[PDB]
Design a protein around this ligand. Structure first.
Ligand SMILES: Cc1ncc(COP(=O)(O)O)c(/C=N/[C@@H](CCCNC(=N)N)C(=O)O)c1O
Ligand SMILES: Cc1ncc(COP(=O)(O)O)c(/C=N/[C@@H](CCCNC(=N)N)C(=O)O)c1O
Lengths: 368, 368
């Protein structure tokens, strides 16, 4: 298994999948009511111009999460099948004019595998240095792009506004591209200050990749949103049009409707449900010997756990035998895999029952 | 402007869109019954292992179109959000080891764009050369892949079985990858002989990209299916896992149901529908001096129309002023654009009434 997706494949057909980060819990009542009008949404998607549906979907999802200054003129937000598709467009776009990319480490490994597969070299930036300290002028001058995941995956760490401001400002000095993956944006209110405000204010060249997938159990019906400053001067628009005409108006209508249910109280319900499920795993494992939780303040839908006397791979292997699937964290540490030798990632975007089943099996594996 | 997808953007929100090749006619009564029961399918897609739904959708789609010998073991058919995304996966896999690609000419231009975009040089192969004769040894040794769109877009030309047998043999003796794009397979029974049987019997390195999207008005809910030989020797699997975990189980359910409606008589209905709309186009242009049809036998869901005394650009600009959006053909001829200077392409996957209005305007235009 050469990336976390190949580990996650093994989980997809198991009742005890706690590996991939997609939302697989039950629909709420308000979400089921949306599913129930799909034949009506379908007809609306046949009948209306996609540009109207698309605008309403973007307006609903950005405002929902505080990004009021998002560029709303047609063309500026590029709807992609997935955040990974948005990522490939950007990585291939960079490769034309950039050699090296400074990337937060750790982070989800397909970000690095895509950047490398498109010919970019990476220089890692540990999280401490990223947040708690400016970045070295020797660094910025040697890279064409800076790339942050916030909320990060697997750590949940949020880039504070103050530091986002400084970072965009540093990038403006060097004419460097500043890129953000905000897939997890909706789980943590610390991420809902208007990033398009600080970004457009610094006036650097910037790219943001939003994602609607993680948040709601939509059966992987979703969009990645690629937003770029007017001065990006990367060929993201042409490469986008090489790949797709657009996304399905029905998926867009569904984003709109799920965004509106989130704004009528569904997002608070979701933050609570994720908190409950985080409590449930911590309740069952903090008292075990060796077990610590390194992201004590994470609000993300995935949770890391650390053990002191065995390797995260070995926990994975022992877990498999009882039909439970999580992720070994080595590969999140894409620049030094050993950094994640003693950790596994657990998915919380699951209904509480099979989650509890899984951690109790995790308990027993650890008490061996 | 830069490619045919960008011309196609102009049409997306207008009543008289006859530009992109997507299926946009109204649902058949049988298809609307699938849609009516989306909530049921949604609850199926929650409860069941996506492996089973995926197996059922593949089996249904392949057997519908005569492709019985397709590799059915899990993992040999990779489901992608779209044909283009399979194409991005393929093109970037080739660049690892191939410098030059022989590509049928004309063909849909994002195939050439995605290849050139990923670092590959292209060599055109005209249609007559491809279908009626061996490819030379000179050509075959200068190239690491041969790429054929069949049925071709925009011409509708289908690569017959004896020529594919011979081409695949040729590719085996040179070690070349034979790559096919069979997105339009459903529209023409001449393409329903078993491709996988001849590729496997020849024992060449091969990849096929199947596509469910073109055939049914599913609001762009579709899958590209990337099928490869066990010895393909391209990183196609690695790069697939980089981009995605899989596609929506709902989309896979939809494919399964539309494929079964198709096998129940719907495909015969489609074929008759497309034939009628082709007859609508051509009879509407009957007595107009200077019109011809370059592909008199095509059964594709797109139709070329040629003009002795007018460029396709002029015609397209004249149609635009009456709010009718077609495609200029120049960019289909991705190696020599003037080859297409006198044709436009008309999308036939439309309800008959808006298509008839558009061509009656075309008729008025041409009589001026
Ligand atoms: C920060 C960040 N940015 C983009 C994506 C891609 O999201 P997408 O899948 O396109 O919707 C993710 C997804 N993380 C999931 C991976 C499961 C899907 N695997 C692949 N896509 N290779 C997880 O960590 O479990 C992400 O965390
Ligand atoms: C032979 C062939 N292979 C793949 C595809 C991609 O299908 P996809 O669109 O990915 O589902 C097409 C699509 N042709 C359509 C629509 C073009 C939309 N533009 C982009 N996708 N960039 C047309 O001819 O108008 C094709 O003909």
């Amino acid at each position: 298994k050469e990336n976390l997706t190949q580990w996650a494949y093994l989980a997809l057909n198991s009742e005890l999948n706690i590996a991939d980060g997609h939302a697989r819990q039950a629909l709420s009542p308000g979400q089921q009511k949306i599913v129930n009008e799909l034949p009506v949404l379908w007809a609306e998607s046949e009948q209306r111009p996609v540009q109207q549906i698309e605008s309403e979907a973007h307006q609903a999802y950005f405002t929902l999460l505080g990004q009021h200054g998002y560029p709303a003129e047609p063309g500026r937000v590029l709807s992609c099948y997935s955040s990974s598709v948005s990522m490939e467009i950007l990585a291939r776009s960079l490769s034309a004019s950039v050699d090296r990319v400074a990337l937060v480490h750790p982070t989800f490994d397909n970000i690095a595998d895509l950047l490398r597969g498109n010919g970019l070299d990476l220089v890692p930036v540990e999280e401490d240095a990223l947040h708690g300290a400016d970045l070295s002028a020797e660094l910025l001058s040697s890279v064409g792009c800076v790339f942050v995941t916030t909320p990060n995956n697997p750590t949940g760490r949020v880039l504070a506004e103050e530091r986002l401001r400084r970072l965009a400002e540093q990038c403006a000095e060097h004419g460097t591209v500043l890129a953000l993956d905000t897939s997890f944006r909706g789980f943590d209110a610390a991420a809902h200050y208007d990033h398009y405000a600080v970004l457009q204010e610094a006036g650097c060249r910037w790219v943001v990749i939003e994602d609607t997938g993680k948040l709601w159990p939509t059966l992987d019906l979703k969009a990645g949103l690629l937003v770029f400053s007017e001065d990006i001067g990367l060929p993201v628009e042409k490469i986008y049009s090489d790949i797709l005409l657009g996304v399905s108006p029905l998926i867009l209508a569904l984003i709109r409707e799920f965004s509106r249910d989130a704004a009528d109280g569904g997002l608070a319900d979701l933050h609570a449900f994720i908190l409950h499920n985080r409590s449930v795993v911590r309740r069952a494992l903090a008292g075990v010997e060796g077990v610590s939780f390194p992201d004590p303040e994470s609000r993300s839908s995935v949770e890391r756990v650390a053990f002191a006397g065995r390797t995260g791979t070995e926990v994975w292997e022992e877990l498999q035998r009882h039909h439970v699937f999580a992720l070994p964290c080595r590969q999140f540490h894409w620049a030094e895999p050993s950094d994640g030798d003693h950790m596994v990632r657990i998915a919380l975007s699951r209904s509480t029952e099979p989650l509890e089943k899984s951690v109790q099996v995790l308990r027993t594996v650890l008490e061996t």
